[PDB]
Design a protein around this ligand. Structure first.
Ligand SMILES: Nc1ncnc2c1ncn2[C@@H]1O[C@H](COP(=O)(O)OP(=O)(O)O)[C@@H](O)[C@H]1O
Lengths: 51, 50
């Protein structure tokens, strides 16, 4: 299937943010990203079944 | 420069033809020190070329 809007939050908090964080090599110590900022993102800038 | 080793990446540019698009590529090449090269793909249909 595609992916639910809320479901994407649980995605990005685990399987997506850390990955890009490992691509740029950062840690939250220098690069924190809360869940609320992520829900705001998907709420505004990206409503697409793909991630 | 921060995360150690070099990585590749893709990009795109767009706008009117003859705007200076191609020129910035070689300018990049002068910036990054890597070899330059270009080639057309317009209108190509057969895949053997790629
Ligand atoms: N910002 C710029 N700096 C230098 N040259 C420019 C710039 N913008 C346009 N040009 C000029 O535009 C012309 C076409 O540039 P180029 O990018 O090589 O061709 P195309 O637009 O087909 O890619 C060149 O003669 C180039 O000098």
């Amino acid at each position: 299937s595609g992916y639910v809007a809320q479901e994407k939050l649980a995605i990005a908090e685990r399987y997506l943010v850390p990955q890009a964080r490992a691509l740029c090599g950062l840690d939250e110590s220098k690069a924190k990203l809360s869940s609320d900022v992520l829900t705001l993102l998907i709420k505004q800038y990206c409503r697409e079944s793909g991630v | 420069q921060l995360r150690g080793s070099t990585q590749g990446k893709i990009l795109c540019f767009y706008g009117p033809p003859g705007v200076g698009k191609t020129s910035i590529a070689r300018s990049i090449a002068r910036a990054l020190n890597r070899e330059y090269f270009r080639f057309s793909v317009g209108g190509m249909t057969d895949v053997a070329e790629i």
